[PDB]
Design a protein around this ligand. Structure first.
Ligand code: IK2
Ligand code: IK2
Lengths: 413, 413
């Protein structure tokens, strides 16, 4: 055959369809994981500055990162992590969080390695693991209005997934799609098993600043003994509400990072210069206002908490049952009552109910959500088929349009 | 061990010690493959427009490319290639030419496949082949002031490199580092063998617009039968003198391109939105002014041809022997007369003479060039140890500074 066998089984990607259904019909798109309002002024101005400043910013910068950006990443996150971070040895700038993940898997995962993934998971973890020759091993959070915090990571289950073949565990907190914010106890559980079995924790923290109800983001790399076995990933797009900038980073110790640098230099070599300058300027702004009321990292999550609360109240009007998230852009609603009363929606054989339900909801109610079964291993999709994911990081006008659709549903319902 | 075996042997980067040595001395940097003058106003303006326009340009665009960009790529290059190009199936936007190359190797090259590489080669072709499990197979152009045109691709030698395991051949024209522009006859030779053995031609055309002395860029995908077995790669950075934008593309038939799409959706998923908009607007400008005196693609090569001629004359004053390039940012000079008169330069074991010479030249003469042995397979570096690469796409002030260094050259010797 023409194509490499590393591509086996990872050519199906359901997002192309999801994005297609999302725009053409007179619909309210609560499926897209990006804001439909502008980034903050200081961020847009930072990018404007980068493309209207030193003309040499139009040319290549340093391979492992624009130095003003690695400098402030190392400064600011070293403070948050309680860690001294070397910008040249412990920081790599990437093409988004997505590229950061890809770089980590290609650096570390080899044929026959096991990778522990926690369900529900951001869907790329599985095919990225597979492309690198890894064997995904799944542990399912146990469902306990419900709260994301009560979805339990069972210690005996998680412990039994660790083997001599375990290379890495992928921890996503705050979690997409569930909105769970991992507690110190849960991180200590993961940390102890990673230390016991000599496993690297790849930790996806792109939603770090999106935490609600006084819950604290805790980075596992800040725990005792974890810096030397953790990679910590962030995203400028989720941090500054500018998802189209596609700038990300990995933080971690040199002995691991050198292998991500090897992947980087043999794949993209440089990231764009001017978006990196914009991101550096943006972090410098937030660092100087850190913990103050006028800082974006205080204002924004407080705003989005109000949007979350609005959506939670509104979706209940139609009998959807939200699970209250403690963080992220997202919440999920249980649709088990609809599956019970309306089981026979059209769909393919072995098509999970939530995919069928979303198609029905888009066409007939004018609302877009994402079926949560895409965030499960295929064998578990039949058992976790009754949730859908909504995004509440939306303009007030959009949430008003959501309420118009919901009011029309209710009278029908 | 911790890291994946695919990284074996590809962490060494020979550029680093020269750029490190470069920054320490008061030097004229003719090693940098980028302009030290601004991109053209219309290109810089286009990026300014994109970051100060529709605020939704700050959010994600479509996975396989910003649609106004894939539209103009497909229109503009379809005409040049004599091919109907569909934006959705035949175009992929990538993170530079680098990212495009990476995507092609990861899609097509598998354990045990052979990949034919033409020496001197842009240096990533080898480690990218290796990381995808392929086996590089090398064919050397034979050196014929000399002209890059006289470096011959021997028909018998080339034909003998093809085997049942040949997956692809990598064609770079115009060539970095040599500046050779492949003739129709040379491309018909490569096409004939690729059709005979069923081999994909990966064709790196990033220097397409940089052609001199009446020489024409010919795209191999335009030859009979070749569109269905060719991938054509371009770079906005080499096209609009904006290397820090890091936007590239691949063009090709769906039956191959679908596999690059699979790699893309499992590695970066999106390219940045606003640089893509800038590139699209820049191409629209050139399309409207195609073949007209005020067009960049007319003006810029003519201007850089004068810079080339200036550099050729200047470097000769010191006993360097230039080979006149027909295209690209680069020219090479033979340093054989220096190896005869000064054979015993300091260096490590088996360190090729040209690498030692460049270090000597940086430290004693204040000029930076790149040793051409980095563009050769290791077994061939001893034979091909007497060329260095200069970049003449430079500000008039940089060329003045070069001439000042050349005046001060003889005093030592
Ligand atoms: C957990 C997680 N990690 C990483 C990423 C990627 O971040 P970036 O945009 O920086 O590449 C994302 C982006 N999510 O957007 C897709 C969705 O609607 O589910 C993410 O959610
Ligand atoms: C042949 C070739 N292909 C691809 C690329 C990559 O293009 P991009 O910047 O678009 O990723 C380059 C960039 N070369 O600059 C490095 C050097 O001085 O040798 C290139 O020369």
């Amino acid at each position: 055959q023409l194509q490499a066998r590393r591509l086996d089984g990872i050519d199906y990607n359901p997002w192309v369809e999801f994005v297609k259904l999302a725009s053409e019909h007179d619909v309210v798109n609560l499926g897209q994981g990006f804001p439909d309002f502008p980034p903050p002024d200081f961020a847009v101005e930072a990018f404007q500055h980068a493309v209207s400043g030193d003309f040499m910013l139009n040319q290549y910068t340093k391979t492992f990162g624009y130095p003003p950006l690695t400098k402030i990443l190392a400064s600011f996150f070293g403070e948050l992590l309680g860690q001294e971070i070397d910008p040249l040895r412990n920081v790599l700038v990437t093409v988004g969080g997505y590229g950061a993940l890809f770089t980590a898997f290609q650096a570390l995962v080899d044929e026959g390695d096991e990778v522990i993934i926690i369900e529900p998971f951001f869907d790329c973890y599985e095919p990225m693991t597979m492309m690198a020759g890894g064997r995904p091993v799944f542990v399912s959070l146990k469902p306990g209005l419900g709260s994301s915090s009560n979805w339990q990571l069972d210690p005996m289950e998680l412990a039994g997934k660790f083997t001599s073949r375990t290379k890495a565990l992928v921890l996503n907190t705050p979690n997409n799609p569930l909105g769970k914010v991992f507690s110190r106890e849960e991180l200590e559980l993961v940390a102890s098993l990673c230390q016991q079995h000599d496993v690297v924790c790849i930790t996806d923290e792109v939603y770090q600043w999106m935490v609600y109800d006084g819950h604290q983001h805790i980075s596992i790399a800040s725990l005792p003994g974890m810096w030397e076995r953790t990679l910590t990933i962030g995203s400028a797009g989720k941090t500054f509400s500018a998802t189209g900038w596609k700038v990300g980073w990995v933080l971690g110790p040199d002995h691991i990072m050198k292998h991500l640098r090897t992947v980087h230099q043999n794949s993209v070599f440089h990231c764009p210069t001017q978006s990196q300058a914009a991101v550096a300027e943006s972090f410098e702004r937030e660092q100087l206002l850190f913990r103050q009321p006028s800082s974006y990292f205080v204002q924004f999550p407080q705003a989005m908490q109000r949007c979350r609360d609005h959506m939670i109240r509104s979706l209940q009007s139609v009998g959807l049952k939200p699970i209250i998230p403690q963080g992220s852009y997202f919440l999920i609603t249980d649709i088990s009552d609809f599956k019970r009363k309306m089981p026979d929606l059209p769909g393919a054989v072995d098509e999970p109910y939530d995919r069928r339900f979303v198609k029905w909801m888009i066409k007939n109610k004018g609302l877009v959500a994402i079926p949560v079964s895409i965030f499960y291993s295929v064998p578990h999709q039949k058992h976790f088929d009754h949730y859908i994911r909504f995004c509440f990081v939306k303009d007030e006008a959009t949430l008003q349009a959501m309420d118009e659709k919901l009011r029309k549903w209710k009278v029908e319902l």
